[PDB]
């Protein structure tokens, strides 16, 4: 946490304090597809010639 | 129009070669399906010829040497040189169709269906020459005159080998015509039938003719139905 402190306001000694950071963030642990039941398949050769 | 028509049949001995055809019209063998299902009545099958051109590895561990044929795509046709025809091959073949993936007819599947095919050609490799067919014309009798019905025909007796096709007034008499197929004899003779059932009335009156074919002796036979006249 010190790091980003220290390279935040672009100097090695920072005066005694408390500075704003970043948020803590949470990477997704699953990428789920919900879709419908369908199986049917769309006549396109009908569509076309 | 869009049919498979079988060509190209003729006599084959033990010793030589003959070029059979598949004939495709309306649709072009260029980018089309041909299989050829081999069938022999009774039994299973088996599909062999493997000709999908372009000429790499694809061959069946059955027929190796044997089974040589080209294709020619511009002219809508496939040409069969069937070389070494074994004497053990009595099978009327028929080309066929398929269905592979990529047409609409599948965006999500396999394929596989045969769908349309031929008629198929009668080609025998006997070691024996060609025999004639003989044509009896079975008269109808007492009982098939007052029976309303009167039953008549020619019987094709004793020709080696197949095959003997039956027509009747050349095409003008369809109506009752019942084709009998031929008997194995003994002595490997065959002996097929072919009753029409008609009116007893037009018996005499109506000129019955029974065109008796045999394409590998090249015999074709007009034979006259009569009635028992002493």
Known sequence: ?49 | EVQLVESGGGLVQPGGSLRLSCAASGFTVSSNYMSWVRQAPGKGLEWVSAIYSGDSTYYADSVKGRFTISRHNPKNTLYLQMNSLRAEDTAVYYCARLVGALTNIVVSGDGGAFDIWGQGTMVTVSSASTKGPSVFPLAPSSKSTSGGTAALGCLVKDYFPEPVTVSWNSGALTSGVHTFPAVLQSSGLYSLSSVVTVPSSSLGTQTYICNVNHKPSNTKVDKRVEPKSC
């Open chain 1, 1 to 49: 946490p010190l790091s980003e402190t220290k390279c935040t306001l672009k100097s090695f000694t920072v005066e005694k304090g408390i500075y704003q950071t970043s948020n803590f963030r949470v990477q997704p642990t699953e990428s789920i597809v919900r879709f419908p039941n369908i199986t049917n398949l769309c006549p396109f050769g009908e569509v076309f010639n």
